[PDB]
Coordinates of N, CA and C in Angstrom, one line a residue:
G1 N -11.1 0.7 -22.6 CA -10.0 0.7 -23.7 C -8.9 1.7 -23.0
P2 N -9.1 3.0 -22.9 CA -8.2 3.9 -22.1 C -8.3 3.6 -20.7
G3 N -9.6 3.5 -20.1 CA -9.8 2.9 -18.8 C -9.1 1.7 -18.3
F4 N -9.2 0.8 -19.3 CA -8.4 -0.5 -19.2 C -6.9 -0.4 -19.3
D5 N -6.4 0.3 -20.3 CA -4.9 0.5 -20.4 C -4.4 1.1 -19.2
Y6 N -5.1 2.1 -18.6 CA -4.7 2.5 -17.2 C -4.6 1.5 -16.1
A7 N -5.7 0.9 -15.8 CA -5.6 -0.3 -14.9 C -4.6 -1.4 -15.2
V8 N -4.2 -1.7 -16.5 CA -3.1 -2.7 -16.7 C -1.8 -1.9 -16.2
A9 N -1.5 -0.7 -16.7 CA -0.4 0.1 -16.3 C -0.2 0.1 -14.8
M10 N -1.2 0.3 -14.1 CA -1.2 0.4 -12.6 C -0.9 -0.9 -11.9
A11 N -1.4 -1.9 -12.4 CA -1.0 -3.2 -11.9 C 0.4 -3.5 -12.2
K12 N 0.9 -3.3 -13.2 CA 2.2 -3.7 -13.7 C 3.2 -2.9 -12.7
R13 N 2.9 -1.6 -12.4 CA 3.7 -0.8 -11.8 C 3.6 -0.8 -10.3
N14 N 2.3 -0.7 -9.8 CA 2.0 -0.4 -8.5 C 1.3 -1.5 -7.6
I15 N 0.9 -2.6 -8.1 CA 0.2 -3.5 -7.5 C 1.0 -4.8 -7.4
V16 N 1.0 -5.4 -6.1 CA 1.8 -6.6 -5.7 C 0.9 -7.5 -4.9
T17 N 1.2 -8.7 -4.7 CA 0.5 -9.6 -3.9 C 1.4 -9.7 -2.5
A18 N 0.7 -9.7 -1.5 CA 1.3 -9.6 -0.1 C 0.6 -10.7 0.7
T19 N 1.5 -11.4 1.5 CA 1.0 -12.4 2.4 C 1.2 -12.0 4.0
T20 N 0.1 -12.3 4.7 CA 0.1 -11.9 6.1 C -0.3 -13.2 6.9
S21 N -0.3 -13.3 8.3 CA -1.0 -14.1 9.1 C -2.3 -14.5 8.5
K22 N -3.1 -13.5 8.0 CA -4.5 -13.8 7.5 C -4.5 -14.2 6.1
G23 N -3.5 -14.4 5.1 CA -3.6 -14.8 3.9 C -3.0 -13.8 2.8
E24 N -3.0 -14.1 1.5 CA -2.6 -13.2 0.4 C -3.7 -12.1 0.3
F25 N -3.1 -11.1 -0.2 CA -4.0 -9.9 -0.5 C -3.3 -9.1 -1.6
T26 N -4.2 -8.4 -2.3 CA -3.8 -7.4 -3.5 C -3.3 -6.1 -2.6
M27 N -2.0 -5.7 -2.8 CA -1.7 -4.6 -2.2 C -1.2 -3.6 -3.2
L28 N -1.6 -2.2 -2.9 CA -1.2 -1.1 -3.7 C 0.2 -0.4 -3.1
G29 N 1.1 -0.2 -3.9 CA 2.2 0.7 -3.5 C 1.8 2.1 -4.1
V30 N 2.0 3.1 -3.1 CA 1.6 4.4 -3.4 C 2.7 5.5 -3.7
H31 N 3.8 5.4 -2.9 CA 5.0 6.0 -3.3 C 6.2 5.6 -2.3
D32 N 7.4 5.8 -2.7 CA 8.5 5.5 -1.9 C 8.4 4.1 -1.4
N33 N 8.2 3.9 0.0 CA 8.3 2.7 0.6 C 6.9 2.5 1.4
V34 N 5.8 3.2 0.9 CA 4.5 3.3 1.4 C 3.6 2.6 0.6
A35 N 2.6 1.8 1.3 CA 1.7 0.9 0.6 C 0.4 0.8 1.4
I36 N -0.8 0.3 0.9 CA -2.0 0.1 1.7 C -2.5 -1.2 1.4
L37 N -3.2 -1.7 2.5 CA -3.9 -2.9 2.5 C -5.3 -2.7 3.3
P38 N -6.2 -3.7 3.2 CA -7.3 -3.8 4.2 C -6.8 -4.0 5.6
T39 N -7.4 -3.2 6.5 CA -7.0 -3.3 7.8 C -7.3 -4.9 8.4
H40 N -8.1 -5.5 7.8 CA -8.5 -6.8 8.3 C -7.4 -7.8 7.9
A41 N -6.4 -7.5 7.1 CA -5.4 -8.3 6.5 C -4.4 -8.4 7.6
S42 N -4.3 -7.4 8.6 CA -3.8 -7.5 9.9 C -2.3 -7.7 9.9
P43 N -1.6 -6.9 9.0 CA -0.2 -7.1 8.7 C 0.6 -7.2 9.9
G44 N 1.7 -7.8 10.1 CA 2.4 -8.0 11.2 C 3.7 -7.1 11.2
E45 N 5.0 -7.6 11.7 CA 6.2 -7.0 11.5 C 6.9 -7.3 10.3
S46 N 6.4 -8.1 9.6 CA 6.9 -8.4 8.2 C 5.8 -8.9 7.3
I47 N 6.0 -8.8 6.0 CA 5.0 -9.3 5.1 C 5.7 -9.9 3.8
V48 N 5.2 -11.0 3.4 CA 5.8 -11.5 2.1 C 5.4 -10.7 0.9
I49 N 6.3 -10.5 -0.1 CA 5.8 -9.6 -1.3 C 6.7 -10.2 -2.4
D50 N 5.8 -11.0 -3.2 CA 6.3 -11.7 -4.4 C 7.5 -12.6 -4.0
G51 N 7.3 -13.4 -3.1 CA 8.4 -14.5 -2.7 C 9.1 -14.0 -1.5
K52 N 9.3 -12.6 -1.1 CA 10.3 -12.1 -0.3 C 9.7 -11.7 1.0
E53 N 10.6 -12.0 2.2 CA 10.0 -11.4 3.4 C 10.7 -9.9 3.5
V54 N 9.8 -9.0 4.0 CA 10.1 -7.6 3.9 C 9.7 -7.0 5.2
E55 N 10.6 -6.4 5.9 CA 10.3 -5.8 7.3 C 9.4 -4.6 7.1
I56 N 8.3 -4.6 8.0 CA 7.3 -3.5 8.0 C 7.9 -2.6 9.3
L57 N 8.2 -1.4 9.0 CA 8.5 -0.4 9.9 C 7.1 0.0 10.6
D58 N 6.7 1.0 10.1 CA 5.4 1.5 10.6 C 4.0 0.9 10.0
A59 N 3.0 0.8 10.8 CA 1.7 0.2 10.2 C 0.6 1.1 10.8
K60 N -0.1 2.0 10.1 CA -1.1 2.9 10.6 C -2.4 2.4 10.0
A61 N -3.4 2.0 10.8 CA -4.8 1.7 10.6 C -5.7 2.8 10.7
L62 N -6.1 3.4 9.4 CA -6.9 4.7 9.4 C -8.2 4.6 10.0
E63 N -8.6 5.6 10.9 CA -9.9 5.9 11.3 C -10.3 7.4 11.1
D64 N -11.5 7.8 11.2 CA -12.0 9.2 10.8 C -11.8 9.8 12.1
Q65 N -12.3 11.2 12.2 CA -12.1 12.0 13.2 C -12.9 11.6 14.5
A66 N -14.0 10.7 14.3 CA -14.8 9.9 15.2 C -14.1 8.7 15.9
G67 N -12.9 8.3 15.4 CA -12.4 6.9 15.7 C -13.2 5.7 15.1
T68 N -14.1 6.0 14.1 CA -14.5 4.8 13.3 C -13.5 4.5 12.3
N69 N -13.3 3.1 12.2 CA -12.3 2.5 11.3 C -12.8 2.7 9.8
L70 N -11.9 3.2 8.9 CA -12.0 3.3 7.5 C -11.7 2.0 6.7
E71 N -11.2 1.0 7.5 CA -10.8 -0.4 6.8 C -9.5 -0.2 6.0
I72 N -8.6 0.8 6.3 CA -7.5 0.8 5.4 C -6.2 0.9 6.4
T73 N -5.2 0.4 6.0 CA -4.0 0.4 6.8 C -2.7 0.8 5.8
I74 N -2.0 1.9 6.2 CA -0.7 2.2 5.6 C 0.4 1.4 6.3
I75 N 1.3 0.9 5.4 CA 2.5 0.3 6.0 C 3.7 0.9 5.3
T76 N 4.7 1.2 6.1 CA 6.0 1.8 5.7 C 6.8 0.5 5.8
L77 N 7.8 0.2 4.8 CA 8.5 -1.0 4.6 C 9.9 -0.8 4.6
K78 N 10.7 -1.6 5.2 CA 12.2 -1.6 5.1 C 12.6 -2.2 3.8
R79 N 12.8 -1.4 2.8 CA 13.2 -1.8 1.5 C 13.8 -0.6 0.8
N80 N 14.7 -1.1 -0.3 CA 15.4 -0.2 -1.2 C 14.7 0.1 -2.3
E81 N 13.8 -0.8 -2.8 CA 13.0 -0.5 -3.9 C 12.1 0.8 -3.7
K82 N 11.9 1.7 -4.6 CA 10.9 2.7 -4.4 C 9.6 2.3 -5.5
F83 N 8.4 2.9 -5.1 CA 7.3 2.8 -6.0 C 7.1 4.0 -6.8
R84 N 6.8 3.7 -8.0 CA 6.2 4.9 -8.8 C 5.2 5.6 -8.0
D85 N 5.3 6.9 -7.9 CA 4.5 7.8 -7.0 C 3.3 7.9 -7.7
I86 N 2.1 7.4 -7.1 CA 0.8 7.8 -7.7 C -0.1 8.6 -6.9
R87 N 0.5 9.4 -6.0 CA -0.3 10.2 -5.2 C -1.2 11.2 -6.2
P88 N -0.5 11.8 -7.3 CA -1.4 12.6 -8.2 C -2.5 11.9 -8.8
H89 N -2.5 10.6 -8.9 CA -3.5 9.9 -9.4 C -4.6 9.5 -8.2
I90 N -4.4 10.0 -7.1 CA -5.4 9.6 -6.0 C -6.1 10.8 -5.9
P91 N -7.5 10.8 -5.9 CA -8.2 12.1 -5.9 C -8.0 12.8 -4.5
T92 N -8.3 14.0 -4.4 CA -8.5 14.7 -3.2 C -9.8 14.5 -2.4
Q93 N -10.8 14.2 -3.2 CA -12.1 13.9 -2.6 C -12.5 12.5 -3.1
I94 N -13.5 11.9 -2.3 CA -14.1 10.8 -2.5 C -14.7 10.9 -3.9
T95 N -14.2 9.9 -4.9 CA -14.6 9.9 -6.3 C -15.6 8.8 -6.7
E96 N -16.7 9.1 -7.5 CA -17.4 8.0 -8.1 C -17.1 7.9 -9.7
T97 N -17.6 7.0 -10.3 CA -17.2 6.7 -11.7 C -18.4 6.0 -12.2
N98 N -18.7 6.0 -13.5 CA -19.6 5.2 -14.3 C -18.8 3.9 -14.8
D99 N -17.4 4.0 -15.0 CA -16.6 3.0 -15.6 C -15.7 2.5 -14.7
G100 N -15.9 1.8 -13.5 CA -14.9 1.3 -12.7 C -14.3 -0.1 -13.2
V101 N -12.9 -0.1 -13.1 CA -12.1 -1.4 -13.1 C -11.6 -1.7 -11.6
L102 N -12.1 -3.0 -11.2 CA -11.4 -3.5 -10.0 C -10.3 -4.3 -10.6
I103 N -9.1 -4.2 -9.8 CA -7.9 -4.9 -10.1 C -7.6 -5.9 -8.9
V104 N -7.4 -7.1 -9.1 CA -7.1 -8.0 -8.2 C -5.7 -8.8 -8.7
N105 N -5.0 -9.0 -7.8 CA -3.6 -9.8 -8.0 C -3.2 -10.8 -6.8
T106 N -3.7 -11.9 -6.9 CA -3.2 -12.9 -6.0 C -2.9 -14.2 -6.8
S107 N -2.5 -15.2 -6.3 CA -2.3 -16.5 -6.8 C -3.6 -17.0 -7.3
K108 N -4.7 -16.8 -6.6 CA -6.0 -17.4 -7.0 C -6.4 -16.5 -8.3
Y109 N -6.4 -15.1 -8.0 CA -6.9 -14.3 -9.0 C -5.7 -13.4 -9.5
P110 N -4.8 -13.9 -10.4 CA -3.7 -13.2 -11.0 C -3.9 -12.2 -12.1
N111 N -3.5 -11.0 -11.7 CA -3.6 -10.0 -12.8 C -5.0 -10.0 -13.6
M112 N -6.0 -9.7 -12.8 CA -7.3 -10.1 -13.1 C -8.0 -8.7 -13.2
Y113 N -8.7 -8.2 -14.2 CA -9.4 -7.0 -14.4 C -10.9 -7.2 -14.4
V114 N -11.6 -6.4 -13.6 CA -13.1 -6.6 -13.5 C -13.6 -5.3 -13.7
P115 N -14.3 -5.1 -14.9 CA -15.1 -3.8 -15.0 C -16.5 -4.0 -14.3
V116 N -16.6 -3.2 -13.3 CA -17.7 -3.5 -12.4 C -19.0 -2.5 -12.8
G117 N -18.5 -1.6 -13.6 CA -19.4 -0.4 -14.0 C -19.4 0.7 -12.9
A118 N -20.7 0.9 -12.4 CA -21.0 2.0 -11.6 C -20.4 1.8 -10.2
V119 N -19.6 2.7 -9.7 CA -19.0 2.7 -8.2 C -19.7 4.0 -7.7
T120 N -20.6 3.7 -6.6 CA -21.3 4.8 -6.2 C -20.9 5.0 -4.6
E121 N -21.2 6.2 -4.1 CA -20.9 6.5 -2.7 C -22.1 6.1 -1.8
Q122 N -21.8 5.5 -0.6 CA -22.8 5.0 0.2 C -22.5 5.4 1.6
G123 N -21.3 6.2 1.9 CA -20.9 6.7 3.1 C -20.8 5.5 4.1
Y124 N -21.9 5.6 5.1 CA -21.7 5.0 6.3 C -22.3 3.6 6.0
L125 N -21.5 2.6 6.0 CA -21.9 1.2 6.1 C -22.0 0.8 7.5
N126 N -23.2 0.6 8.0 CA -23.5 0.1 9.4 C -23.9 -1.2 9.4
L127 N -22.9 -2.3 9.4 CA -23.4 -3.7 9.6 C -23.0 -4.1 11.0
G128 N -23.7 -5.0 11.6 CA -23.7 -5.3 13.1 C -23.5 -3.9 13.8
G129 N -22.5 -4.0 14.8 CA -22.1 -2.8 15.3 C -21.0 -2.2 14.4
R130 N -20.2 -3.1 13.5 CA -19.0 -3.0 12.9 C -19.3 -1.9 11.7
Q131 N -19.4 -0.6 12.1 CA -19.8 0.5 11.2 C -18.5 1.0 10.4
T132 N -18.6 1.6 9.4 CA -17.5 2.1 8.6 C -17.9 3.3 7.7
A133 N -16.9 4.1 7.4 CA -17.2 5.4 6.7 C -16.4 5.6 5.3
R134 N -17.0 6.3 4.5 CA -16.2 6.5 3.3 C -16.3 5.2 2.4
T135 N -17.4 4.6 2.3 CA -17.4 3.3 1.5 C -17.9 3.7 0.1
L136 N -17.5 2.8 -0.9 CA -18.0 2.9 -2.1 C -18.8 1.5 -2.3
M137 N -19.6 1.3 -3.4 CA -20.5 0.2 -3.6 C -20.6 0.0 -5.1
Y138 N -20.6 -1.2 -5.6 CA -20.5 -1.5 -7.0 C -21.2 -2.9 -7.1
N139 N -21.7 -3.3 -8.2 CA -22.1 -4.7 -8.6 C -20.9 -5.5 -8.9
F140 N -20.7 -6.6 -8.0 CA -19.7 -7.5 -8.1 C -20.1 -8.8 -7.2
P141 N -20.1 -10.0 -7.7 CA -20.1 -11.2 -6.9 C -18.8 -11.4 -6.1
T142 N -18.8 -10.9 -4.8 CA -17.6 -11.0 -4.0 C -17.5 -12.5 -3.5
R143 N -16.3 -13.0 -3.5 CA -15.8 -14.2 -2.5 C -14.8 -13.5 -1.5
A144 N -13.6 -13.8 -1.6 CA -12.6 -13.8 -0.5 C -11.1 -13.6 -1.1
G145 N -10.5 -12.9 -0.4 CA -9.0 -12.5 -0.8 C -9.1 -11.9 -2.3
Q146 N -10.2 -11.3 -2.7 CA -10.4 -10.1 -3.6 C -10.1 -8.9 -2.6
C147 N -10.3 -9.0 -1.4 CA -9.7 -8.1 -0.4 C -8.5 -7.7 -0.9
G148 N -8.2 -6.4 -0.8 CA -7.2 -5.5 -1.3 C -7.4 -5.0 -2.6
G149 N -8.3 -5.6 -3.3 CA -8.5 -5.0 -4.8 C -8.6 -3.6 -5.1
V150 N -8.1 -3.2 -6.1 CA -8.0 -1.7 -6.4 C -9.1 -1.3 -7.5
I151 N -9.8 -0.2 -7.1 CA -10.7 0.3 -8.1 C -10.2 1.5 -8.9
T152 N -10.2 1.3 -10.2 CA -9.7 2.6 -11.1 C -10.8 3.0 -11.9
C153 N -10.8 4.3 -12.4 CA -11.3 4.8 -13.5 C -10.0 5.7 -14.1
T154 N -10.3 6.1 -15.3 CA -9.0 6.6 -16.1 C -8.4 7.6 -15.4
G155 N -7.1 7.5 -15.2 CA -6.2 8.3 -14.5 C -6.2 8.5 -13.0
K156 N -7.2 7.9 -12.3 CA -7.5 7.9 -10.9 C -7.6 6.5 -10.4
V157 N -7.0 6.3 -9.2 CA -7.2 5.3 -8.2 C -8.1 5.6 -7.1
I158 N -9.3 5.2 -6.9 CA -10.3 6.0 -6.0 C -10.6 5.0 -4.9
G159 N -10.1 3.7 -4.9 CA -10.8 2.9 -3.9 C -10.1 1.5 -3.6
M160 N -10.5 0.9 -2.6 CA -9.9 -0.4 -2.3 C -11.0 -1.4 -1.6
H161 N -11.1 -2.4 -2.2 CA -12.1 -3.5 -2.0 C -11.9 -4.0 -0.5
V162 N -12.9 -4.1 0.3 CA -12.7 -4.5 1.7 C -13.8 -5.3 2.1
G163 N -14.7 -5.8 1.3 CA -16.0 -6.3 1.7 C -16.9 -6.6 0.6
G164 N -17.9 -7.3 0.8 CA -18.9 -7.8 0.0 C -19.9 -8.7 0.3
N165 N -20.8 -9.1 -0.7 CA -21.7 -10.2 -0.5 C -22.0 -10.7 -1.9
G166 N -23.0 -11.5 -1.9 CA -23.4 -12.3 -3.2 C -23.3 -11.4 -4.4
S167 N -23.8 -10.1 -4.3 CA -24.1 -9.3 -5.4 C -23.3 -8.0 -5.5
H168 N -22.7 -7.5 -4.5 CA -22.1 -6.2 -4.3 C -20.7 -6.5 -3.7
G169 N -19.8 -5.5 -4.3 CA -18.6 -5.4 -3.5 C -18.5 -3.9 -2.7
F170 N -17.8 -3.8 -1.7 CA -17.6 -2.7 -1.0 C -16.1 -2.3 -0.9
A171 N -15.8 -1.0 -1.2 CA -14.6 -0.5 -1.2 C -14.4 0.6 -0.1
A172 N -13.2 0.8 0.3 CA -12.9 2.0 1.1 C -12.4 3.1 0.0
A173 N -12.7 4.3 0.1 CA -12.4 5.4 -0.9 C -11.0 5.8 -0.4
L174 N -10.2 6.2 -1.5 CA -8.9 6.8 -1.3 C -9.0 8.3 -1.5
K175 N -8.3 9.2 -0.7 CA -8.1 10.4 -0.7 C -6.7 10.8 -0.6
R176 N -6.2 11.7 -1.5 CA -4.7 12.0 -1.3 C -4.0 12.3 0.0
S177 N -4.9 13.0 0.8 CA -4.7 13.4 2.3 C -4.3 12.3 3.1
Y178 N -4.6 11.0 2.9 CA -4.2 9.9 3.7 C -2.8 9.7 3.5
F179 N -2.1 10.2 2.6 CA -0.5 10.1 2.4 C 0.0 11.6 2.7
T180 N 1.2 11.6 2.6 CA 2.2 12.8 2.8 C 1.9 13.7 1.5
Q181 N 2.3 15.0 1.9 CA 2.3 16.0 0.8 C 3.3 15.7 -0.2
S182 N 3.3 16.2 -1.4 CA 3.9 16.1 -2.5 C 5.0 17.1 -2.9

């Protein structure tokens, strides 16, 4: 109810569908001209956003102080439109919740809200060599181009879906320090 209303608000205001080389993805707008996507979406020099080609200025793929990939990429965009600033809503520390909502917004999964329940910290996800840090985990039957989906609990955006399997989703946690000071 309040958890849900938040998720809907966030989708309206700050979530868009973005197309790359690699396909459509849910993308979060964070502030100004800055937005995040799964690193594996592999954004180029431009990205389509709700019909429109948009020039990508910078593209930063996040790693930890060890150079392990966090599976998130920040992109600054050549655009006039500004996003509602949601840095206050992104926690300073990796956050868990008993009542997660996953938000997905593509042509396949438009404006789709999935309460996944418990989102727990698992830290190091070591699959193959392809290790990753700061992951979250939740029960969700994952397919494909749910990638980019956003995890909420009330007032907070805590995560970004980047992975999964038959029974579980994997997100990259969000920390306010990933963006500029306020």
